[PDB]
Design an enzyme around this catalytic site. Structure first.
Site, mmCIF file in Angstrom:
data_model
loop_
_atom_site.group_PDB
_atom_site.id
_atom_site.type_symbol
_atom_site.label_atom_id
_atom_site.label_comp_id
_atom_site.label_asym_id
_atom_site.label_seq_id
_atom_site.Cartn_x
_atom_site.Cartn_y
_atom_site.Cartn_z
ATOM 1 N N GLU A 1 -34.252 64.345 -25.517
ATOM 2 C CA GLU A 1 -34.820 63.042 -25.789
ATOM 3 C C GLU A 1 -34.225 62.389 -27.036
ATOM 4 O O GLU A 1 -33.808 61.235 -26.984
ATOM 5 C CB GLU A 1 -36.348 63.108 -25.948
ATOM 6 C CG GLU A 1 -37.154 63.310 -24.666
ATOM 7 C CD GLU A 1 -36.946 62.223 -23.599
ATOM 8 O OE1 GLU A 1 -36.408 61.135 -23.899
ATOM 9 O OE2 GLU A 1 -37.323 62.470 -22.432
ATOM 10 N N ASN B 1 -36.148 49.522 -23.954
ATOM 11 C CA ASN B 1 -35.948 49.473 -22.519
ATOM 12 C C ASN B 1 -36.095 48.004 -22.172
ATOM 13 O O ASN B 1 -37.206 47.495 -22.000
ATOM 14 C CB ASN B 1 -37.013 50.308 -21.805
ATOM 15 C CG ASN B 1 -37.081 51.745 -22.332
ATOM 16 O OD1 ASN B 1 -36.138 52.533 -22.155
ATOM 17 N ND2 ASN B 1 -38.187 52.087 -22.999
ATOM 18 N N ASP C 1 -38.356 46.632 -19.007
ATOM 19 C CA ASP C 1 -39.796 46.399 -18.999
ATOM 20 C C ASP C 1 -40.384 46.005 -20.354
ATOM 21 O O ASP C 1 -41.599 45.924 -20.499
ATOM 22 C CB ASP C 1 -40.531 47.608 -18.404
ATOM 23 C CG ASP C 1 -40.639 48.785 -19.369
ATOM 24 O OD1 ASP C 1 -39.798 48.953 -20.277
ATOM 25 O OD2 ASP C 1 -41.597 49.562 -19.201
ATOM 26 N N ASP D 1 -39.182 53.397 -26.759
ATOM 27 C CA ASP D 1 -39.420 54.833 -26.864
ATOM 28 C C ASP D 1 -39.267 55.162 -28.345
ATOM 29 O O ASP D 1 -38.288 54.759 -28.982
ATOM 30 C CB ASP D 1 -38.384 55.599 -26.039
ATOM 31 C CG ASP D 1 -38.516 55.329 -24.545
ATOM 32 O OD1 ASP D 1 -39.663 55.272 -24.055
ATOM 33 O OD2 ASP D 1 -37.482 55.186 -23.864
ATOM 34 N N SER E 1 -40.453 47.678 -23.211
ATOM 35 C CA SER E 1 -41.120 48.748 -23.940
ATOM 36 C C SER E 1 -40.082 49.481 -24.795
ATOM 37 O O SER E 1 -38.884 49.325 -24.585
ATOM 38 C CB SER E 1 -41.797 49.725 -22.965
ATOM 39 O OG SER E 1 -40.854 50.501 -22.235
ATOM 40 N N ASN F 1 -43.247 56.538 -25.167
ATOM 41 C CA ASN F 1 -43.236 55.129 -24.773
ATOM 42 C C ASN F 1 -44.423 54.267 -25.214
ATOM 43 O O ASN F 1 -45.601 54.663 -25.108
ATOM 44 C CB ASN F 1 -43.000 55.023 -23.257
ATOM 45 C CG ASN F 1 -42.646 53.616 -22.808
ATOM 46 O OD1 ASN F 1 -43.520 52.860 -22.415
ATOM 47 N ND2 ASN F 1 -41.361 53.286 -22.807
HETATM 48 NA NA NA Z 1 -48.833 52.158 -26.083
#
Ligand code: NA
Length: 130
Positions: free
Chosen positions: A35, A46, A49, A53, A51, A60
């Site tokens: 990761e 990302n 969408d 990480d 969002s 996320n």
């Molecule tokens: Na959240």
């Protein structure tokens, strides 16, 4: 902070991750490795969408932490996403524990399926004294 392999392994053990919800320490190590490369300040947007990480486990923002800019997001860990970027990984661990309490468990992370599932992950903890 970029952790050294065994340093992280011993830290995770002290934080009670070994066998947490049936997940062995080597699996958590395999996950952190793929990761973030053991990097606590790692972030990944990302664009698909909207969002992001965050941290060592790349948690996320859509469900786990709040960063304010992710549409229709929730904060199950009840933490600002910034807490997942500290050198001290206590909060990231508490949140990772929350994630696996969901039915999917460790499978919540697609990377774990790709790089860790059904593989010999002993290599991640060997020689670490854990
Ligand atoms: Na959240």
């Amino acid at each position: 902070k970029v952790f050294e392999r065994c340093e992280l392994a011993r830290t995770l053990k002290r934080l009670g991750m070994d066998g947490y919800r049936g997940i062995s320490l080597a699996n958590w190590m395999c996950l952190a490795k793929w990761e973030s490369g053991y990097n606590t300040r790692a972030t990944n947007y990302n664009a698909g969408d909207r969002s992001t990480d965050y941290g060592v486990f790349q948690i996320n923002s859509r469900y786990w932490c709040n960063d304010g800019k992710t549409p229709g997001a929730v904060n199950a860990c009840h933490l600002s996403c910034s807490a997942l970027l500290q050198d001290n990984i206590a909060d990231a661990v508490a949140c990772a524990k929350r994630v696996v309490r969901d039915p999917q468990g460790i499978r919540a992370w697609v990377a774990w399926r790709n790089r860790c599932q059904n593989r010999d992950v002993r290599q991640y903890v060997q020689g670490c004294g854990v």
